[PDB]
Design a protein around this nucleic acid. Structure first.
Ligand SMILES: [K+]
Ligand SMILES: [K+]
Ligand SMILES: [K+]
Ligand SMILES: [K+]
Ligand SMILES: [K+]
Ligand SMILES: [K+]
Ligand SMILES: [K+]
Ligand SMILES: [Mg+2]
Ligand SMILES: [Mg+2]
Ligand SMILES: [Mg+2]
Ligand SMILES: [Mg+2]
Ligand SMILES: [Mg+2]
Ligand SMILES: [Mg+2]
Ligand SMILES: [Mg+2]
Ligand SMILES: [Mg+2]
Ligand SMILES: [Mg+2]
Ligand SMILES: [Mg+2]
Ligand SMILES: [Mg+2]
Ligand SMILES: [Mg+2]
Ligand SMILES: [Mg+2]
Ligand SMILES: [Mg+2]
Ligand SMILES: [Mg+2]
Ligand SMILES: [Mg+2]
Ligand SMILES: [Mg+2]
Ligand SMILES: [Mg+2]
Ligand SMILES: [Mg+2]
Ligand SMILES: [Mg+2]
Ligand SMILES: [Mg+2]
Ligand SMILES: [Mg+2]
Ligand SMILES: [Mg+2]
Lengths: 208, 66, 117, 132
RNA sequence: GAUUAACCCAAGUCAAUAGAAGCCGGCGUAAAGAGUGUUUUAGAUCACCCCCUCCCCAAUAAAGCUAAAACUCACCUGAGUUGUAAAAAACUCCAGUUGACACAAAAUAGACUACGAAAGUGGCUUUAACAUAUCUGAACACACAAUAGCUAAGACCCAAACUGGGAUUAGAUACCCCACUAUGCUUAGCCCUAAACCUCAACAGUUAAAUCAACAAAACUGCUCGCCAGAACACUACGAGCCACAGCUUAAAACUCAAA
RNA sequence: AUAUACCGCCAUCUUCAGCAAACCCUGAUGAAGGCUACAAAGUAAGCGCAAGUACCCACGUAAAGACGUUAGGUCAAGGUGUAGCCC
């Protein structure tokens, strides 16, 4: 890194700075007076202080980027969000007054919930015991759970099973399926739970 | 506190790393005590100024056009 | 009380057959052994089996196992923070008996003297 | 391990001069060049010809003042002048130095068709920078 | 090898052979304290003086006894039990609970350190019983001597050479799993071996001097018996003795090497 | 011909931190060994690391990287010992 260890990461949050002084504790007062003497890295060109910023969608976009082509990756993302919203507006106008109350039309709410429905609770990690590796079911950290949900969704959309279907139409279709606890990405989560439940006998190999 | 290489110049002798720690541990023990003026000029002989450059941003002048 | 060593070893003047055959001289070393790294017990394994039990009866549908999944999640987080604190307290504080490194420094100052000076 | 122009450590009895004591990566950092001309500047010509001349002058002087040179030559070019600065010892009689100066300057002037001058600085012994 | 020069001896030179030249040193690990004790003919001065560990604890022989755990049988119950890094084979009159029930073996005590000549001896009781008022004293005399083994007659839970089956492996005459026999036990006779080593002989004495190659379990003195003298051949051959007949004890040489 | 005679220039450990003259001490003055900071026999020039320097910083990247290891590579860069060829 071209930053020395003395550089601290920037905090990009308008609310954090407009907070009155009276509400601050003696510990939060120390951190604010400390940062006035520290070196701060330049804010990356990715995140800003915008009110439409979504760190989860930004991360999903980078995981779709091929060869640093962010423009194309970002283009596929907004086309998916538009495709999801148009499908929900079409399902909304074609529904009855009672069914309309249960139809979600916010693509950001659908995207977050669809990924949350695909996150696995437990995984298989190799543990060495007696000179052999055993696939031991273990709890996954929050980072790993969220990462696996995104990776499974992107991998499913790149599968060759889809013939000539463009990414925004494929992804929008998979998100709405996962949003309703259906589709192949939900099935992949169930398989990891079934394969972790089969190795239930090896769970005691864990030591944390 | 002055570094070992600076102490090796005030003394004009070669010091070990552990020799330097022992001397610093003994000066710190002298500050915690109720040291007087005579005991304060002595400790300052071994304190070097660690000037901290201000991180305050420099403001550009406000100009006026035609 | 330490067991006796009188007449236990094969020596001149000791008529009886030896009681002990130490493969190392019975002389205190100037150091103690290093504490072995221990393997802890798995945490939340009880909540893990309760969660995987509802899955078997509900066709692995998370919607029906929310309370069991949540319990297994909360336990994992609590077991994570406790694991994070066990290091700061037990490894650094040296609670109870001293650590081998500190205890060996104390033996350095009072070495066993099996010879004359 | 790198070898180029490195006097390797010994038992502490090998005297080395300042130039011999610095490896190639110190050129332009702690030691200068032994020849100065414009041939290697951007947009300049005849670098190949200046190089051959330098190599010859160093061999010529080495064999013309045998056992006298106490250091490498410094070759300087200004216009069409050629200045040769050499550090020599004080073993040969002055008469022989004056003969060799008059002889070498004249011979080199006719060989390379330019006014050549030789500047001699005498030392009682080889200047030692360190003992490797 | 020739040649040049030099060195030694010299009317000799020196190749082969032979002879001269050798026990007061050792024995924990280099060769050597030979499994144990006793005595003889003798030897020693450690025997009179002059003295402090008798009895008891897991010596030995005989007779009797049995707490835990097995085996077997019976009732009830189950449909499997065994095997493990993992399998197969094996059993399925099998397994679990309960009760009855040894010619086998002796948790804890024992962190004790005792007994016996050594080998050995650690469940309980009883009987008999553990030589010598100087010391040393044997491959062979005299009497003993773990385990394995032999002969004969019994017992048999468990273990188990061999053998059979299963598995592994390039092969597996093994290591792993199962089964079962000789054998381990008793009785009566043999056999006489061990890293029978605490590799340190018995008795008497010392802790000062030079403390002492190394390591091991500090270094020595007196006295006696036993034993040793390069390696290998060789726990062998031959002879002799022996209840031993593919055995044990005693035990060489030739050829070979310049080391071990 | 010989890289197994070599100079020259390098690979490699090295994405290392060690190398070492001259001394001193310990082991009965043997081959050998030499530290404990509430310190117990080590002192050490020099070399390397480090520091400095280049590039856009004090960061990073370059460069640097000893003694030795593989008789490592190159007699076909050039030079060269030894041996060989000279219608
Ligand atoms: K003759
Ligand atoms: K018992
Ligand atoms: K024997
Ligand atoms: K033994
Ligand atoms: K070379
Ligand atoms: K060459
Ligand atoms: K050559
Ligand atoms: Mg031993
Ligand atoms: Mg390199
Ligand atoms: Mg021997
Ligand atoms: Mg016991
Ligand atoms: Mg006797
Ligand atoms: Mg005899
Ligand atoms: Mg015998
Ligand atoms: Mg017997
Ligand atoms: Mg028998
Ligand atoms: Mg059996
Ligand atoms: Mg039988
Ligand atoms: Mg019996
Ligand atoms: Mg024995
Ligand atoms: Mg005797
Ligand atoms: Mg012999
Ligand atoms: Mg034998
Ligand atoms: Mg025989
Ligand atoms: Mg015979
Ligand atoms: Mg080479
Ligand atoms: Mg830098
Ligand atoms: Mg580099
Ligand atoms: Mg550097
Ligand atoms: Mg080679």
């Amino acid at each position: 890194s071209r930053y020395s260890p003395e550089f601290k990461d920037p905090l990009i949050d308008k609310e954090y700075y407009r907070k009155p002084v009276e509400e601050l504790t003696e510990e939060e007062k120390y951190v604010r007076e400390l940062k006035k003497t520290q070196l701060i890295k330049a804010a990356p060109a990715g995140k800003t202080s915008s009110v439409f910023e979504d760190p989860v969608i930004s991360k999903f976009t980078n995981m779709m980027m091929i060869g640093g082509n962010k423009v194309l990756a970002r283009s596929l993302m907004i086309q998916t969000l538009e495709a999801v919203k148009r499908k929900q507006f079409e399902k909304y106008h074609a529904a009855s007054a009672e069914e309309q109350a249960t139809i979600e039309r916010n693509p950001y709410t659908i995207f977050h919930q669809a990924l949350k429905n695909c996150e696995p609770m437990i995984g298989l990690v190799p543990i060495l015991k007696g000179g052999r590796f055993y696939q031991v079911p273990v709890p996954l950290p929050d980072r790993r759970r969220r990462f696996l949900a995104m990776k499974w969704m992107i991998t499913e959309c790149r599968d060759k099973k889809h013939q000539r279907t463009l990414m925004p139409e494929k992804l929008s279709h998979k998100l709405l399926e996962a949003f309703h606890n259906q589709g192949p990405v939900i099935k992949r989560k169930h398989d990891l739970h079934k394969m972790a439940e089969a190795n239930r006998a090896l769970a005691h190999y864990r030591w944390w | 506190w002055l570094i070992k290489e600076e102490l090796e110049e005030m003394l004009v002798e070669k010091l070990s790393d552990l020799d330097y720690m022992q001397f610093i541990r003994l000066l710190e023990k002298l500050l915690t005590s109720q040291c007087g003026a005579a005991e304060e000029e002595f400790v300052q002989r071994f304190r070097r100024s660690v000037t901290l450059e201000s991180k305050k941003q420099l403001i550009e002048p406000v100009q006026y056009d035609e | 009380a330490t067991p006796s060593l009188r007449g236990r070893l094969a020596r001149f003047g000791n008529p009886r057959k030896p009681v002990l055959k130490p493969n190392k001289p019975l002389i205190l070393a100037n150091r103690v052994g290093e504490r072995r790294r221990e393997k802890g017990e798995a945490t939340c394994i009880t909540e893990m089996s309760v969660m995987m039990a509802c899955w078997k009866q509900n066709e692995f549908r998370d919607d029906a196992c929310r309370k069991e999944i949540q319990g297994f999640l909360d336990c994992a987080a609590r077991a994570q923070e406790a694991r994070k604190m066990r290091s700061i307290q037990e490894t650094l504080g040296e609670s109870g008996s001293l650590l081998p490194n500190k205890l060996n420094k104390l033996l350095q100052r009072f070495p066993n003297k099996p010879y004359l000076s | 391990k790198n070898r180029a122009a490195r006097v390797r450590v010994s038992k502490g009895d090998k005297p080395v001069t300042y130039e011999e004591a610095h490896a190639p990566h110190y050129i332009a950092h702690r030691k200068g060049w032994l020849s100065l001309h414009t041939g290697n500047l951007d947009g300049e010509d005849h670098a190949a010809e200046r190089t051959v001349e330098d190599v010859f002058l160093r061999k010529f002087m080495w064999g013309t003042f045998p056992g006298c040179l106490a250091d490498q030559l410094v070759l300087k070019r200004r216009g069409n002048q050629l200045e040769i600065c050499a550090v020599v010892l004080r073993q040969l009689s002055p008469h022989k130095y004056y003969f060799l100066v008059g002889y070498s300057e004249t011979l080199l002037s006719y060989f390379y068709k330019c006014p050549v001058r030789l500047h001699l600085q005498t030392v009682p012994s080889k200047v030692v920078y360190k003992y490797l």
